[PDB]
Amino acid sequence: GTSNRDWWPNQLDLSILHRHSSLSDPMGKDFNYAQAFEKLDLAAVKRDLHALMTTSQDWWPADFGHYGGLFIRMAWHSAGTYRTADGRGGAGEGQQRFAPLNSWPDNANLDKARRLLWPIKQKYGRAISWADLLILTGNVALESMGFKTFGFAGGRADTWEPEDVYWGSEKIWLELSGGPNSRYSGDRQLENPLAAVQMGLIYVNPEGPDGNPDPVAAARDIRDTFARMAMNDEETVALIAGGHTFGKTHGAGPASNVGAEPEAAGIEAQGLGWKSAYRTGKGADAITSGLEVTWTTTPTQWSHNFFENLFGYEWELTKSPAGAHQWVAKGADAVIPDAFDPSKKHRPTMLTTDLSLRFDPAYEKISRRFHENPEQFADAFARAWFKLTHRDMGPRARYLGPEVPAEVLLWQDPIPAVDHPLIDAADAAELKAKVLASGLTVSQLVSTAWAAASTFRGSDKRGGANGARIRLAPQKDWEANQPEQLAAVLETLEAIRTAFNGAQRGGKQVSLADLIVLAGCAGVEQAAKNAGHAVTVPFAPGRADASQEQTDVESMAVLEPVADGFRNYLKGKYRVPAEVLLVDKAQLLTLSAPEMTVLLGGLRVLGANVGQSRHGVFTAREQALTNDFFVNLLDMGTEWKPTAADADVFEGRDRATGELKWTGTRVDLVFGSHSQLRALAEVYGSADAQEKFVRDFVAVWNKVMNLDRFDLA
Amino acid sequence: GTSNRDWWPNQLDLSILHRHSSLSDPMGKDFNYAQAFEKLDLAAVKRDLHALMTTSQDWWPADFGHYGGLFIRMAWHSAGTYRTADGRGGAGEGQQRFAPLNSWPDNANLDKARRLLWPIKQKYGRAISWADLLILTGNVALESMGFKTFGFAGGRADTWEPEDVYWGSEKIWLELSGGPNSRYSGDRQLENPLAAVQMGLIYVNPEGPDGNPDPVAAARDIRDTFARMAMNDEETVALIAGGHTFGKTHGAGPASNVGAEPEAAGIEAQGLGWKSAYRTGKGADAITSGLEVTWTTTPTQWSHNFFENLFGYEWELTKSPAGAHQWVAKGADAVIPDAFDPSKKHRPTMLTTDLSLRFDPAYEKISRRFHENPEQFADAFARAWFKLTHRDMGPRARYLGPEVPAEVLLWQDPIPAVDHPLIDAADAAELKAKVLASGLTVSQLVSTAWAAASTFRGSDKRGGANGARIRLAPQKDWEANQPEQLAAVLETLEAIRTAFNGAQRGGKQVSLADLIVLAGCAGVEQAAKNAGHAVTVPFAPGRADASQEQTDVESMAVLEPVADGFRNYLKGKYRVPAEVLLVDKAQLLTLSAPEMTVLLGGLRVLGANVGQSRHGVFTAREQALTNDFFVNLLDMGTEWKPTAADADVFEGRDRATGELKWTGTRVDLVFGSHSQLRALAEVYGSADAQEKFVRDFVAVWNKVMNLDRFDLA
């Protein structure tokens, strides 16, 4: 059947904003996963998982009688899709069970791992999500084999359809770099937001870059991809050596024996894939990656044998039975156990990417230190495993259960506890009036609050106005935040705050994070008043102010907006049209198309544009909250044309006189062009819509202000 | 960006079930269009529409100073996508304003018509939908030009995204038949459910079949397509001749002058398309279809000139200025007015498809009768225009406003008014006990009520249990309804009914339509009791029984299910896989994926399969309402394979012994295979889910029983 996407493959796709509807969710609209999880007997689930580890099923027999290595890989892949550039991917939504991830070649045979967990899932039901269970099972695997984990938090709610993620443009699984849709350009520069070297890989190619088995070159790819998954050199070494202390790879015969991935398999496979014609097709004959490596002499026990082997031998390039490049220890004895036959032993083996840990000079130093001090290795691996598996969970307030680590980690963007009484509704009114009396304008107040709250992204639940990090490096200096303007507003607000807090009794005080939000609320109320409408904008206190010392400046860099349609802002010239980037930002903010539309139209007439640009400011009463953007956009008395100087900027002229009325960007005009957006704009531009426009704007403003408020969840 | 659809183009698309979510809708979830419409000043809207007729805008000047013809085509095209096969298309959701229909070639320049209506739409706001306004505008155009319409009902709610409709598989706009994705095969057989001869056309090619200008062959295409839009020969002749009494076609220069359709145009076009480089690009120079024909000597007034010209001249094949085939009156004088220049006149002209009305022998007789008896022509056209434009609105109960015709028409599948007291809750309890005491089984009761209620489709709101048409021709003889078994059940129910009604006072009685549904409710209650659960199933009385003479048997044929996954039924072997047909059926029933899942799993264990097939009956306690379907489907102790005798039937065998445990179809197993459906099945197959399964089943059962109950809306 030919679809709109086929006919108009470059029109904008709004369906990404309408996922996660209550229609697709089988739980009641009242279901609260956190409440279900808080009643789970987590100890009982772990005891069941522990027993599973050594209870082999004949449809996928356990290597060495222990599934631990398989489940560690499963949990690591569940997490290992994460990209810091947009916060997409990660373990937090259990997306490994859906397309495309369930059928990525790097996820081959993890369908079996997930199926092994069905009986436990079935037992505990809605009290443990698949997303939590995946991670939990990796923890229990590690515990069962003698490794002390750093802790575990539940609270990843299950999702019910695939997330819309850009995974790259290649039309061929695992395509080598340099094709017509190459994700690389220049000197092996990986395109943002990607974090893997080939379509369908988690990070890197275990044979080496584009298959070339050079551990030094491979180390470059490791370092770049891991950095794009928020991991530094020490964390990267600890993760790879830690993981590869367990289990084995599977490459017992030629890859041409392996059939269709799960999404392409026949219905009778019941969601499983990669059925293999090679001998029994499983167990001793398994083929997964094609490589056939077992790293340590005790694959079912934590040890420091990975580094003893890496540094204790020299390595020879060889081929697996499927033809994949891999390395064997020169002159070694057969000291590694076989996974099924107690009478057979094998020489130590390694992947090209394992050897990177020795042959890259900066990794070598860390690997040596971990080899000489295995307790340092164990602690680094525990911390990194925690980080990896929790990186997209959001604020610590979302962490559930009895195993949450008490240590506050800098990577969590921590928010201090509030230890004083909060402002009440009368105090909020007094502060709104003091803010308005200071002479801060609607434009300044709205722009400042927008800048602080709009860093939130629902992908990894980082950002938001909680913390007041807008006053800190690096947010205070982002160009989108207008650093000089911002500084003058913050200075005025900080004086109001000091005066209010100094006049209190009882220990009551207001955070600057709260005041910034409240002040933006006053700005929206005043704008409504300027239009003749009396509204109260909701406000919930309880944010706290984080310090510079509790803020990782480098980690914060990925939250910088380089494109923010809501402020008509674009930091440079990009390959992706600006309207596409608007919808991308709307999705990260968790907005629907109607919400996006209302919010944009309002922000335009409130003076939220960076630099005071007049683009899209289609009103003669700026700083009044009206539906003028829509009424003027939709007026067929104006004709629009792109400018000579800039094809991305348009002039609206009176059709009859030729007089210049307005200018706008693609971001503005899309609302008059795209057939679904223009239908939304028509609702808000109708004669009966001014009260609705104000109400719906106040509601979406409040939603944005509260995106990070999981303390009130 | 490579997507799941790109990698796995034949996996099933469930997003079709999650359209129309409140996410995409800018109105509140409380908005009720009927209530808004009931307050509209319809008379005021019409007076604005009358004024618009002759208010020419320079950007698309009105032919003859009057936009009536353009708006008549606009309304006709809005209605003219309707297919009786699935009830999809039609004017009832205003989908002409969205992709792909807004950009179909046959809708060229109707973007101008719709934009001329924006100021009216803006003025009245939510109180008149675009869907209603399109049709109203065509009515006002006809009235303005002298033709009295039969009536008008409001109540078409606007929609906010494109409908998922199969419009054919061709990848080229307007591709001629016989290509790699031909919609024709055999002796000019058009594939179901399609109702147009080429991709992007409303019905037929105005030059003739595949462009060949043979009016007799064209007539065959006219008759087949119009039949597939619910129109017989008399209605077809009346519509074509009635429509082409007005206005003109547009073909002033070569088609190569015409630019991108709206969905491909630049953002500056602000939703419009087909910008033309030919001279002024508009008015006297307009190019729409490429034909250049004006049918009557008074194109802005109702007349009897269409048939005077059709019969009064002989016709010669010629070409338009764009090179399109059309016909000119041999030896005629220049009697037709020009649209713009009072000093020019033209010879009468006709399309190939116009001449079909004379050269097809059956149309000739109708056309002659209409020529000789123009009052008959007028009344037929008024009735047919009403039908065309309201065909998809559903029962009469949905018709709003002061212009609804009082005459009840056969095509509306009318339901008699209820004129007696309805049964109350005590009476319902008494009838359910009598039903259960009769000896009717859970299987019979459930299967019968399912058969009655599940004929509903939300596409055109035909079907459902209202009317008791299951006891009439042709429903009582459909294979899917198990005619013999059905007859036995109905005989028992009719006896119950007779006895209950004979015992009443005060004129109370129960319809058989109600009793069918109520008896199905009793069967569901009984099934829950068989499983140990105490469940009351909601029931709403008020259905009435329609007569045979109120049931057009040929019109009812298109509701016959040839595939109904919910009864594991397929009438033959089809090119579309059965699981695709299930989701299609779920969409017509208005079900979400979780609803579809729960419903199907319950029906299987209640004995709703046609022929008492064991396919998918994964329980040892049939006729008990349990979640056994899910628990057994998801059991990894069973391995499934297709049978030797039939690749569409699967055997599930114990993995350890090889013993046969179950059989299933593709419809059954998809719930175990599709990664989103299996995630749903997992929720209902969990240990905590038995009570939820029962409750969610009763809710969806009730939903289906009430799909046609617009009397209670």
Ligand code: HEM
């Ligand atoms: C450069 C990064 C990495 C590369 C290229 C890589 C590559 C691979 C490959 C190719 C396999 C074999 C799959 C098969 O045939 O079954 C595998 C296995 C494994 N990986 Fe990694 N890996 C990397 C990092 C990680 C990390 C960070 C972890 C966990 C912390 C991990 C844990 C494991 C485990 C436990 C297995 C064994 C699975 C089994 O016993 O079934 N790896 N790895």
Ligand code: HEM
């Ligand atoms: C065999 C069926 C039909 C064919 C092939 C057909 C074809 C066409 C074409 C090709 C045009 C010219 C488009 C343009 O260049 O502007 C047109 C115009 C029109 N048709 Fe039809 N038509 C059909 C049936 C109908 C019916 C059922 C109605 C209404 C009841 C209708 C009413 C109109 C009117 C009013 C116009 C004039 C538009 C104007 O003045 O701008 N037609 N038709």
Ligand code: NA
């Ligand atoms: Na994420």
Ligand code: NA
């Ligand atoms: Na329809």
Ligand SMILES: [O]
């Ligand atoms: O891995």
Ligand SMILES: [O]
């Ligand atoms: O038409």
